[PDB]
Design a protein around this ligand. Structure first.
Ligand SMILES: *[C@@H]1O[C@H](CO)[C@@H](O[C@@H]2O[C@H](CO)[C@@H](O[C@@H]3O[C@H](CO[C@H]4O[C@H](CO)[C@@H](O)[C@H](O)[C@@H]4O)[C@@H](O)[C@H](O[C@H]4O[C@H](CO[C@@H]5O[C@H](CO)[C@@H](O)[C@H](O)[C@@H]5O)[C@@H](O)[C@H](O)[C@@H]4O)[C@@H]3O)[C@H](O)[C@H]2NC(C)=O)[C@H](O)[C@H]1NC(C)=O
Ligand SMILES: O=C(NC(Cc1ccccc1)P(=O)(O)[C@@H]1CCC[C@H]1C(=O)N[C@@H](Cc1c[nH]c2ccccc12)C(=O)O)OCc1ccccc1
Ligand SMILES: *[C@@H]1O[C@H](CO)[C@@H](O)[C@H](O)[C@H]1NC(C)=O
Ligand SMILES: *[C@@H]1O[C@H](CO)[C@@H](O)[C@H](O)[C@H]1NC(C)=O
Ligand SMILES: [Zn+2]
Length: 598
């Protein structure tokens, strides 16, 4: 009978979860070694261990059918069993799985090994994205130099892996169908446990889109005054290489030329960090300080002993796109970041430590629950702190911002600066997965794959390549997450929900009151707030033990993903910007791009 079986099932899960942590530890160690040191030997080791774990997962999924788990009384037990039935890529036949792993490492290693030649010196051909190319894209205001680096990078990181990407799409689809999802789109969306999730995001995006159009319009106007109308047209999509980022995902790097009030202060603390002798170690210690100040968990000794926080100075190849690592034991958590001493990197450190904090908060949970409530939650944690770190309030406290007068004009500058990071990103993030979903779902013919990418970038973001592209190019994998097969919707979700978290954390900290002019949301610092920390502990400690609305409820009593909070934060900017665009007769919207030839 079922009563006795459910008792046996509980013991089965308890033992199996422990076995899964231990087996995954081994896979994670091999993946860490490869990411830290790209070699053919390490590639082989990583992929062989994964193949072994996949084989065990197949046996696990098979064993779940021996339990009448759908008949059980315990929602908790049922939730754990359901999690075990979900094989993902491990559902593929042995050979197909091995081919997929080979395809994935081929794409990640290609991305990591990209080197271009110096614009001024065709002899020097050892410039990597991190840090050499990214430095030029962010700092150069020479549009031809910018276009050179754009083309060189996209050709090498994107086009070079078209055939691999094609095989990846095929195997991803085969895997999804073996799990009885329609495609990889549905497989990814399953992580949000909500059949209306896509529509919810369409609705929120539609609400924020008009504000994005205004920012777009204003930035284009300002870029015309800098580069001239030969480079930037009034009515067309913005040439993306002028936006301070290789993928135009955030535009904060060009704030100095597009800021609302150029004669007023613009927060840029990179120079002060260098002046005060900041190091990657100091930055991480400061991040640790922020979490502990909120009564959250201190970084364990394993973290300091084992993390890589600076780019290695030997000749080795490695993945320099930052990552946080859970090894599924106790306190064995790690970061690999090629850290630089900049304002942006200080935020990145806090983002990374948000992942690490989540690992520590839920490490007592059964293995299947040791992940985010949904992927967006994991990405949001560190950003909530970064929002307060970025405030003039906090930056003055740590002596990085000097002689600052927070008048109305300085406030608009700061809000705009934040919008260039937070609002601008929304259409970008949506398109990363809208694109891959359409390929996964078989909605785009292979002959149209490249211009399908640029069409979305045009439609949603109103940006375009600096030069004419065609179906002879393949540009999507020039973005890390696309080469590395990392779902991107998590970041769109994060950028929305992080303002729900921030607003509530600020209210809890007594740092935000909508009726108190002295406590604006955009200058809230949650540093040292145990009350804000309590909310985080209540939520993060749950891991994936409950559907995400219950985790949100544990934080602030709400159960609904909402764009209300992000709109609330940016409302003073919206009012000012709508008026400024009218005052300057700023053209809003864009004609269809001519930069991708069919
Ligand atoms: C994705 O969807 C797939 C369907 O599109 C699905 O594939 C199906 O999985 C079924 C298992 O759940 C499987 O059903 C079995 O069928 C066997 C015979 O099928 C053969 O002939 C078919 C032609 O008619 C072919 O198409 C097949 O390829 C096969 O060759 C049966 O022998 C088998 O039966 C046994 O098991 C049932 C299970 O009973 C349940 O559990 C307990 C038993 O302890 C019961 O008390 C309880 O009431 C409950 O019913 C027993 O009742 C029975 O006595 C036998 O022991 C079973 O029906 C099916 O064949 C398979 N394919 C298809 C095309 O349907 C995938 O599993 C899905 N994948 C995922 C990951 O979810
Ligand atoms: O390490 C990562 N992940 C990252 C990348 C990665 C994923 C999978 C394998 C390997 C690596 P990253 O998001 O820290 C990560 C590394 C630094 C920035 C982050 C990023 O990619 N951000 C996005 C979005 C973005 C751009 N600018 C910003 C600024 C602030 C927040 C996000 C953001 C990007 O495109 O780079 O994941 C840890 C994890 C484990 C288990 C569950 C959940 C999470
Ligand atoms: C990189 O890996 C090689 C073998 O693949 C190993 O011999 C070497 O020690 C590693 N290098 C570093 C710097 O760890
Ligand atoms: C710190 O957190 C602990 C539990 O983690 C809690 O019991 C304690 O009240 C918190 N300290 C403060 C000052 O709130
Ligand atoms: Zn992250």
């Amino acid at each position: 009978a079922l009563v006795k079986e459910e008792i046996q099932a509980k013991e089965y899960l308890e033992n199996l979860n422990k076995e899964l942590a231990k087996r995954t530890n081994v896979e994670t160690e091999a993946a860490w070694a490869y990411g830290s040191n790209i070699t053919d030997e390490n590639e082989k080791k990583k992929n062989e261990i994964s193949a072994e774990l996949a084989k065990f997962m197949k046996e696990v999924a098979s064993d779940t059918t021996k339990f009448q788990w759908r008949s059980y009384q315990s929602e908790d037990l049922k939730r754990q069993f359901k999690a075990l039935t979900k094989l993902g890529y491990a559902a593929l036949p042995e050979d197909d799985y091995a081919e997929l792993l080979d395809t994935l490492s081929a794409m990640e290693s290609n991305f990591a090994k990209v080197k271009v030649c110096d614009y001024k010196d065709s002899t020097k051909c050892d410039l990597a994205l991190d840090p050499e190319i990214e430095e030029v894209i962010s700092k150069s205001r020479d549009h031809e130099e910018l276009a050179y680096y754009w083309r060189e990078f996209y050709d090498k990181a994107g086009t070079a892996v078209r055939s691999q990407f094609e095989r990846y799409v095929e195997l991803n689809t085969k895997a999804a169908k073996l799990n009885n999802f329609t495609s990889g789109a549905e497989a990814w969306l399953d992580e949000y446990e909500d059949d209306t999730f896509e529509q919810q995001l369409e609705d929120i995006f539609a609400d924020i889109r008009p504000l994005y159009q205004q920012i777009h319009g204003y930035v284009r106007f300002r870029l015309r005054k800098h580069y001239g109308d030969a480079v930037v047209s009034e009515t067309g999509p913005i040439p993306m290489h002028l936006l301070g980022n290789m993928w135009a995902q955030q535009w904060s790097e060009i704030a100095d030329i597009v800021s609302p009030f150029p004669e007023k202060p613009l927060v840029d603390v990179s120079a002060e960090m260098e002046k005060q002798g900041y190091t990657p170690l100091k930055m991480f210690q400061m991040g640790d300080d922020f979490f502990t100040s909120m009564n959250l968990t201190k970084l364990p000794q394993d973290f300091w002993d084992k993390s890589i926080i600076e780019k290695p100075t030997d000749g080795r190849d490695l993945v320099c796109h930052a990552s946080a690592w859970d090894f599924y034991l106790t306190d064995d958590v790690r970061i690999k970041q090629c850290t630089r001493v900049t304002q942006d990197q200080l935020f990145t450190v806090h983002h990374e430590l948000g992942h690490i904090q989540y690992f520590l908060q839920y490490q007592h949970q059964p293995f299947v629950y040791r992940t985010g409530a949904n992927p967006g939650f994991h990405e949001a944690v560190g950003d909530v702190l970064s929002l307060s770190v970025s405030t003039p309030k906090h930056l003055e406290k740590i002596g990085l911002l000097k002689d600052y007068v927070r008048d109305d004009e300085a406030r608009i500058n700061q809000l705009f600066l934040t919008a260039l990071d937070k609002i601008v990103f929304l259409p970008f993030a949506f398109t990363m997965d809208k694109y891959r979903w359409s390929l996964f779902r078989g909605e785009v013919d292979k002959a149209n794959w490249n211009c399908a990418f640029w069409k979305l970038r045009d439609e949603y973001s109103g940006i375009e390549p600096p030069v004419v592209r065609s179906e002879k190019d393949f540009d999507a994998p020039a973005k890390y997450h696309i080469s590395a097969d990392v779902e991107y919707l998590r970041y769109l979700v994060s950028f929305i929900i992080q303002f729900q978290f921030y607003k509530s954390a600020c209210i809890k900290a007594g740092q935000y009151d909508p009726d108190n002019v002295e406590l604006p949301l955009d200058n809230c610092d949650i540093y040292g707030s145990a009350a804000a920390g309590a909310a985080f502990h209540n939520m993060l400690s749950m891991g994936a033990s409950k559907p995400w609305p219950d985790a949100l409820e544990a934080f602030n009593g709400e159960r609904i993903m909402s764009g209300k909070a992000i709109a609330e934060y940016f409302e003073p900017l919206r009012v000012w910007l709508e008026a400024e665009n009218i005052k300057n007769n700023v053209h809003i919207g864009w004609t269809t791009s001519n930069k991708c030839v069919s």
